[PDB]
């Protein structure tokens, strides 16, 4: 009979388990025997307190490096303001030691945990690449609670070295099964930011994770976008509980918050899932998340049923992670077929945007070719356009099965006249749909201003397979 942790703050970890059902169903995974043994997670952040009483037992120097100072030791830099506490808080969410009379427990409290010290310094492209590419045959899962500025006017993503690190990781990492990159979708909610303007979250190679409050609401900091895949609990208003984890200076905190707390909880759940089936590929893991995540009782005004009967929201992706369901489905999972890529250049001429532009195109999705896709995974609309005030644009993409993805919502602070230069807006909302048929792109001016610009390129990029479908939900 499984015995739950006795740690002093475990009763305050409301998001791990409870009678109430407002949790991530993590105790159910523990009771199936999965606690993370043998899985290696690295926190890419501002360092990790490797001697913390709730981390030392799980600490893994092979999962760690200091990119900022170019040494093996990721110890945080101690300051009066405790600026470099962030990575230690994230690490405890994944892998804080259980049943040791200290603080609470990690989701994967028997996993090995490391940290890359890379945020405490200039975060260049090379710095990101060296962190994302660290020991990729030892580290299984990388967790990143950072990214481009959430001011609601930035469009930015991985530069060349970092993107090369993503492709090398998913292609050759973890013995060719592919590194698992987990990303926090962003804190730009107050600025009406869109997490599709962040190339890290918008990447197909990352599992972008959003947040829900204890009472099941969209937190103030949350960013909505179509690239988000799923959700874990985090902080909300001051009547709602927060996240319990290891803090800097060997302390315990019950007030870890924001998007930063959601990605590590997802990384811990993915660690449990990898223990249940170490042969899962990076794409397998995303399929598992899509199939098992739970919308129920998460409040949003945009819940929609996609072409295969799954509920999807721009605030939550496919909903809350469910650790018990993840580890159960993982055990007899059949590896997905190799990923196909079908490139469809849509436009035959540039199109003036004006007040509203609609582009309709019927595609065959590479019918008759080895990259024929009947089972969609990610879809991208790679757009090149000029516009005088970027944040007045709203962009939607409708799949042949009728699923409307918001690629870009209005961003009031985005005054840029720089437009989009082949920006690969991504949606997860048509996962498992047949992409043959009519796709519709809509670009509209959401303001009364007399704005102007031109769409000069629209590449529809479809990823997926041609086999293995389930009967729709």
């Amino acid at each position: 009979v499984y015995q739950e942790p006795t740690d002093p703050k475990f009763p305050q970890q409301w998001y791990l388990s409870g009678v109430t059902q407002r949790d991530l169903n993590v105790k159910a995974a523990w009771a199936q025997g999965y606690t993370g043994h043998g899985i290696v997670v690295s926190i890419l952040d501002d360092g990790i307190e490797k001697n913390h009483p709730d981390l030392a037992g799980n600490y893994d120097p092979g999962a760690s490096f200091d990119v900022n100072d170019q040494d093996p030791d990721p110890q945080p830099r101690y300051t009066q303001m405790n600026d470099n506490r962030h990575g230690t808080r994230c690490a405890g969410e994944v892998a804080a030691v259980a049943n040791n009379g200290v603080c609470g427990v990690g989701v994967a409290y028997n996993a090995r945990i490391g940290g890359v010290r890379m945020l405490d310094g200039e975060v260049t492209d090379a710095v990101e690449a060296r962190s994302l590419g660290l020991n990729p045959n030892h580290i299984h899962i990388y967790s990143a609670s950072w990214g481009p500025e959430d001011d609601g006017k930035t469009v930015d993503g991985p530069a060349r070295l970092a993107e090369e690190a993503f492709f090398r990781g998913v292609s050759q990492g973890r013995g060719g099964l592919g590194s698992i990159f987990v990303w926090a979708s962003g804190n730009g909610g107050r600025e009406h930011d869109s997490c599709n303007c962040d190339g890290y979250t918008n990447s197909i190679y990352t599992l972008s994770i959003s947040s829900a409050t204890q009472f099941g609401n969209v937190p103030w900091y949350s960013e909505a976008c179509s690239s988000t895949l799923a959700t874990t609990y985090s902080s909300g208003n001051q009547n709602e509980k927060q996240i319990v984890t290891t803090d800097l200076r060997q302390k315990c905190t019950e007030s870890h918050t924001g998007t930063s707390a959601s990605a590590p909880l997802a990384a811990g759940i993915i660690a449990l899932t990898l223990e249940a089936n170490k042969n899962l590929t990076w794409r397998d893991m995303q399929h598992l998340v899509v199939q098992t995540s739970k919308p129920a009782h998460l409040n949003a005004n945009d819940w929609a049923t996609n072409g295969v009967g799954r509920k999807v929201s721009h605030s939550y992706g496919y909903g809350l992670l469910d650790a018990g369901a993840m580890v159960a489905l993982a055990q007899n999972w059949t590896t997905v077929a190799p990923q196909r890529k079908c490139i469809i250049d849509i436009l035959t001429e540039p199109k003036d945007i004006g007040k509203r532009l609609e582009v309709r195109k019927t595609v065959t999705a590479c019918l008759g070719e080895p990259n024929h896709i009947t089972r969609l995974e990610h879809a991208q609309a790679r757009l090149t356009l000029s516009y005088n005030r970027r944040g007045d644009l709203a962009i939607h993409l409708v799949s042949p099965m009728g699923t409307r993805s918001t690629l870009l919502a209005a961003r009031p602070h985005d005054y840029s006249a720089d437009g989009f230069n082949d920006w690969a807006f991504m949606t997860t909302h048509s996962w498992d749909e047949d992409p043959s048929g009519e796709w519709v792109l809509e670009i509209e001016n959401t303001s009364e201003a007399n704005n102007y610009g031109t769409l000069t390129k629209f590449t529809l990029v479809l990823y997926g397979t041609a086999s293995g479908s389930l009967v729709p939900r």
Partner: peptide
């Protein structure tokens, strides 16, 4: 910074 926590 180019990237934020």
């Amino acid at each position: 910074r180019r990237r934020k926590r």
